[model samples]
Target chain A: EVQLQQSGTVLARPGASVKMSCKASGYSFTSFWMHWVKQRPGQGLEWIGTIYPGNSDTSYNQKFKGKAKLTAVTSASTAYMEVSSLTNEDSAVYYCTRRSGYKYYALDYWGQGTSVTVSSAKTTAPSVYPLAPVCGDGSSVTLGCLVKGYFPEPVTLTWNSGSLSSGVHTFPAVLQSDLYTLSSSVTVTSSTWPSQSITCNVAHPASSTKVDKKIEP
Target chain B: DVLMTQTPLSLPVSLGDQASISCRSSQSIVHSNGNTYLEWYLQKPGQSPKLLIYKVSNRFSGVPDRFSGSGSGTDFTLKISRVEAEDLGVYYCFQGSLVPTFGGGTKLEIKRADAAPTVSIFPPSSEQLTSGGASVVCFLNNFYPKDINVKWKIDGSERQNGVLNSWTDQDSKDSTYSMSSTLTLTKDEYERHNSYTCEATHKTSTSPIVKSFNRNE
Candidate 1:
């Protein structure tokens, strides 16, 4: 009944670093090899490295050669993994595993995952504009809008027509550039007055405030 | 570094049956000194892995007669007879023959009813036992439901510690389980004329499956 207790979530900035610990109990501390695993969002499991607590000897995956460092403190019966030169890609959940018995192939025991969040600035925000809001004849006007930009995204959008209908927004042939640029448009008929208005709002995770544009018809 | 490859990504065994798992290494696991570092382990659900066979064909004392290991050079196998309910887990082969490596695991699942595994204890390995402290293995073999528990008692009182591990029989498709709980008796303790016991219990058992050893033995 060996239990591995891990540290809590760590918040660090890009170019900085964070270290986590896994304390072991119910087993001989130096009897087995200790390893670390990384699970990034949108990816599969990645092996970080392993260390021998008895000697502090370590080995790491090539992918993590420069990114991670494995160390163990014999006195404390604790193992640690340090990730350096952090990046948004480095934001992931890290787990400490034990390699016991006759094989070192799979992890037999795991510590609760410690989430490492590399906080960075959200610099990209989508741009928006209104189009075709005029009536040609004595009949009706169609108010339409277009939006672009929204890169590195989770760009949420809205039509502020007093809490617009749920299905009011649609993407028009979206194109992903460096930051995923796209066009979105919303339309409203002219049954309303020529004085009717439409407003489009765009938001991104990097920023707290929403970028918006208001149009009058 | 030794490379080990295990097959049959998964296995499903009917209860009260037999199963076999193999591990092939890239290089011979035997050392120039005539000792092989090959070992076998089972990783049961939510539990630390249990050591089944060590240095090739030798079962860690207490390991059941039903669980056997054989083969040499780059190939090895672990077999479980009369599969029980707790044998649902992954089986792995590790080569300590060199830098140490683990084979991809073979997962097992029980197809029917579960059964209790046979429990036994192996005295300390040969010379080590005769020459020094006692490192004993409390073996629980081919049991089911993956909830096997093992406790240690000195004389008659219980103590809580050591390598407490459980693994499902990989050869069986997880219908049965096994465990190996190891404890050490220092030279002073071994010479103290104290009696030691391994008490193994399964969820379905009315009483513990016990194995005892005298300090003189």
Candidate 2:
């Protein structure tokens, strides 16, 4: 019943540092040891280190010494790994695993991998494109918007002057060549399509820009 | 590869007594699909390995309620509430999280005497060579009193390098013991016209059982 929920993907600049979290549930967090493992794209796994939350004791593989730090918060039931002085070689999926007691060999619970991508690209603004409305059921119409080529995610998308929220669906951002792209869809009643103004507004803080694209019927 | 260790290697119990085996993994056996890939198997004499518990503790179909699995995060236990005569044999914990690995088997015996193993060797198959090096395996099947020694000889000269031995396993069908040794050869070594020999010595045998194979054979 033990579960380890890990943080999501991270895009970091070369030579910078990145930290990820793994929250444990369904068991006593202080009773077991949490370990970190790294895997490059299409590569094998490498052991990073381990942390015991109960006593805040930690150990690292010689290979990861000084490169990765392991920490845990007993009260929060979470473990954290911070990799410093990142390089392209350090870009990989990192996983947090739990081991019972001091035994180093058996990891019974595993967190979903957190992907880290390191790059040196400059910040870029997202290009927003609002597509023509598509007639859905006899009562409704669907509007789609595409946001492409953004750096350092956490963007917000709004429909029609932020008036629409209920029927909006935003997909996860997809990373491509150091940039990100995303799509969002909204559905509205068919009678309001051609008469009302429909706009897709994108707020990308990294690029310091806000884009508003009007949807044509 | 994830290393799975099971202890105690030998469990001596009376019929109807409670028995428990502990399995620990070096890495978490949880897959990205949000499932633990840890499994338990029992091998009876003259039988193949049979699944008793899967995904940590769930019993396989038709398995008795007396057998149960429990534990999470690198430390796990398989418990037999009441040991029966039919349950005597070897038990192994398997991890399918990364590269598949099996724990060194635990033998459940009823104060029994030693039994001899039947040894057989197989030459490297064509598909095995296609990957990289050639590997020859020697199997020791249906033995009891688990301790045994295996050796590899090339052209009658003992060789130690590139030799890999597997932990003894119990056959679920007949509750007997089984194990294997493997010898890996580079392309140059495999092309050489040399006879390879596998010799196994057990407590019940006066002489070591020997099997040989060559590329031409």
Candidate 3:
């Protein structure tokens, strides 16, 4: 199996800028371009940009310009990108991706993500609050999450711990919604995860996974 | 070949602003079928990037008339009308024809500044000459995934950034992003094209990535 391992977690303060790395294994690193992605807590995934490792050339999502810098180093089987101007808005879990050759319009492979939490940076981003309702009786807590933006429609909400390979730890059945929003939410009943600061993750369609936080309500 | 798909990062991350995303074709749309097979679409944050453009840029049967598609060859764009708060979500460009390319996902957000930023140009800077004179405009060239606007603003001017005049997209094996501006100066003043400035802004509110070159300097 092809595996993409991301670097360590980043805990940054607002206003302070930090950099992260994503290392790839089991693939021809030089033949592909690297892509960086950003996922803020409790929010859906946002595409940052892409980098051609061969020349270290990059292209931003334009939306990520000024905030994201996508770069790569083909020699080390690793790709690098740095985001500047630390602010709460900059705080988010960032990931790196690789596409076959300079053919990097979409993501075919992804690295695990490294998070950059920009708190105290006092950003202009409006607060994003996901309504995570918790129901803890004596038996177990049924923590429900409504992942606002998910692709492929009708996907069930997912719960995970640390590394995804560890599996979602828990995923409930998906119930498709009939409303045009066709909005769907997931309800997972777990003894450990609910009390354990669980995350309701959505698909990073291109590659990787974006996490949304939820506590036992 | 890789299949790429993108939606809003967060539906209607805000309101009033338009949603724009590109669809990169994995290979060049200049194929043998005599038809450039690529498409552009829109997906509110929770939905998917629908088919807004096809072998020909045409609106699908039941799309919200507000969305529009334009561009030829591999380059294409999807634009939304009167951006609303509900429009907040991820936006993505995908190339359905060719080798299967896609632009990185885009999450439209308000145009607001955040923190310490950096500036870098992609595809290097290239120059172009107009029919009027030897002086020409230097463009950053091809930005595959961008969430902001590109401008050629007159320095020290009191004007509101050169009206954003005009821009067009060009696609590649991946998604394509390239831009240029007409130098509207007379032959004498056109000499200063070397000293002009071009900037790119993120979708967020703030200043842009300003790059200036002075031929005399």
Which candidate leads the pack in lDDT? 2
User: Tens digits of per-residue lDDT for model 2 on A17-56?
Assistant: 9989999999889988787877675344456887888898
List model 1 lDDT by residue over A5-43, tens digit each: 989867677899888899999888797888786767433
What range of 10 consecutive residues in model 1 chain A has the weakest lDDT sum? A133-142
Give the alpha carbon lDDT tens digit for every residue of B3-115 in model 1.
78887657667767888898888777678988777777775654445567776787765567778899876788888898766666778776654455566778777554567
- DockQ, per model, reads 0.01, 0.01, 0.02
Q: What fraction of the true interface does each of the listed models get right, in terms of native contacts kept?
A: 0.00, 0.00, 0.00
- Per-residue CA lDDT of model 3 for B1-217, tens digit only, reads 4434343333322355666665544335555756554544334542333444444355555556667777664456678777755444455554533333455566555543232212221111112123332322323233433344555544444224222122322222223333333223445544544445557665444777675544442
TM-score (all chains, Cα) for each model: 0.42, 0.38, 0.34
Candidates ranked by DockQ, best first?
3, 2, 1
Deviation from native of the Cα of residue B163 in model 2, angstroms: 49
Candidate 1 displacement at residue B207 in angstroms: 53
- Order of quality (lDDT): 2, 1, 3
- Over the stretch A1-217, how does candidate 3's per-residue lDDT look in tens digits? 5466777766566566687777788877766667676766445455577766666766666577787766666767777777777876786677675554332223545665786655442212111113333112233323333332122222333445333222121222221221101111232345565456665554443223444545434
In model 2, the runs with Cα more than 4 Å from the true position are A1-11, A15-32, A37-48, A51-117, A133-140, A161-167, A207-210, B2-55, B58-217
Interface RMSD of 2: 24.0
